[PDB]
């Protein structure tokens, strides 16, 4: 309806509370396996932030799985950084992690993170 009011901080507050659920491991419904390392998350959040998880979990079959193993060439630290971004909007980009973060974001199909990593790499050349 046309006649609505909007709470400016609502989307951020919701994300904060989803991140708190993640940290307390409440209603997490998937374990993402990256090399030997394990990451518990919510399928909904993963889908909302990644082109790859949107595709996996829209699939009738793969969506009922509690474990998802990622390509062995995926750096765990790179995935951990991107998983923290999904739930907080903050990306921990450092000189020593930008290559692994960009490679991981391309794989996860996270367009904005890819574009940003490109601009930051171009600046250092």
């Amino acid at each position: 309806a046309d006649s609505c009011i909007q709470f400016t901080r609502h989307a951020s507050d919701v994300l904060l509370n989803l991140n708190r659920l993640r940290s307390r491991d409440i209603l997490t419904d998937v374990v993402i396996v990256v090399s030997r390392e394990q990451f518990r998350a919510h399928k909904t959040v993963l889908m909302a932030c990644s082109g790859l998880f949107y595709s996996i979990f829209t699939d009738q079959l793969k969506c009922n799985l509690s474990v998802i193993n990622l390509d062995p060439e995926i750096n765990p630290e790179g995935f951990c950084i991107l998983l923290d971004f999904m739930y907080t909007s903050r990306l921990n980009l450092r000189e020593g992690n930008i290559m692994a973060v960009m490679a991981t974001a391309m794989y996860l199909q996270m367009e904005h993170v890819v574009d940003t990593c490109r601009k930051f790499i171009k600046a250092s050349e």
Partner: peptide
Amino acid sequence: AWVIP
């Protein structure tokens, strides 16, 4: 094992 390629 299997992975997501």
